[PDB]
């Protein structure tokens, strides 16, 4: 009835050089190339039909395969004229639906295009944001208690609320089990804040780092199509 058909487009290393995922595809009208993004990939929410290009790929041709007619215009326009053949991923015959998601996997090492970066750039802003709010909570919490415990015992009622929050950890209280409470809060805060921070790292590490793909494959683009 209705189902999500996962279609993949893979670009590998050939004996004739590396394949490219791109909108820069020869032998196809503007009609086809029109529907694709700067990165040669179809737009999410597109109403695609059999034949339409979902992911633009290209493959190097190699001497043997060059018609003298193209050897000539290669000489006229420069090496990268008729360098490659269209091997992009199209929608199979008969099938029809609407793209609801695309997923780009890039191997460790490959240059990240514009599309990829913006996405990467965005996921960083968040990973970071997630931390600020995480930290805001951590402070607003523990520090509400430090005050409480602080006031109770050695009250600076109004005085305390002035000096920046970072100056509270400084102030001390009449030796007492109430100083040991102020001890742990300090430890806890730092220990935790640290932990939360080294989590932002492990996040950035993953975001930028390449994907563990098979040997030979450079990048994989998985299109998710809703077929009725």
């Amino acid at each position: 009835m209705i189902h999500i058909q996962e279609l993949a487009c893979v670009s590998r290393d050939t004996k004739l050089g590396p394949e490219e995922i791109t909108a820069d595809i020869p032998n196809v009208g503007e009609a086809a190339l029109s529907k694709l993004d700067e990165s040669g990939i179809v737009y999410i929410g597109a109403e695609v039909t059999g034949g339409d290009i979902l992911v633009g790929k290209v493959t190097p041709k190699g001497e043997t395969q060059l018609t003298p007619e193209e050897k000539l215009l290669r000489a006229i326009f420069g090496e990268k004229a008729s360098d490659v053949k269209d091997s992009s991923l199209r929608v199979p015959n008969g099938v029809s639906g609407t793209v609801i998601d695309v997923q780009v996997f890039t191997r460790d090492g490959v240059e990240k295009d514009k599309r990829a970066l913006e996405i990467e750039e965005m996921q960083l802003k968040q990973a970071k944001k997630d931390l600020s709010e995480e930290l805001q909570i951590l402070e607003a919490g523990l520090f509400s208690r430090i005050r409480a415990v602080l006031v109770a015992g050695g009250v600076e009622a109004e005085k305390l609320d002035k000096l920046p929050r970072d100056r509270w950890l400084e102030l001390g209280l009449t030796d007492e089990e109430k100083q040991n409470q102020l001890e742990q809060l300090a430890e806890q805060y730092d220990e935790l804040k640290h932990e939360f921070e080294k989590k932002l790292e492990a996040k950035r590490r993953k975001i930028t780092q390449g994907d563990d793909l098979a040997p030979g494959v450079l990048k994989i683009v998985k299109v998710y199509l809703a077929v009725k």
């Binding site: 909108a23 020869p26 007619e69 000539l72 215009l73 006229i76 326009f77 490659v84």
Partner: protein
């Protein structure tokens, strides 16, 4: 012994498109072959007037990467 005079070869070319009614491309691809000139030397034997008429076919036929059509 000398074919050099491009104008010559150029006038000689369009003759083939007018009779054999073949693609400007196929044409000049042949002209070269028949005289044993490599494509890499089209510059010294082919008139840049006739080239233009190939460039035209290429676009109209999308024989090239959109990337190169622009520049």
């Amino acid at each position: 012994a000398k074919l050099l005079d491009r104008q010559e070869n150029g006038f000689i070319i369009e003759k083939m498109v007018e009779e054999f009614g073949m693609s400007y491309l196929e044409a000049t691809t042949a002209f070269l072959e028949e005289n044993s000139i490599p494509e890499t030397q089209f510059a010294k034997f082919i008139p840049s007037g006739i080239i233009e008429k190939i460039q035209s076919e290429a676009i109209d036929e999308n024989l090239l990467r959109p990337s190169v059509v622009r520049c």
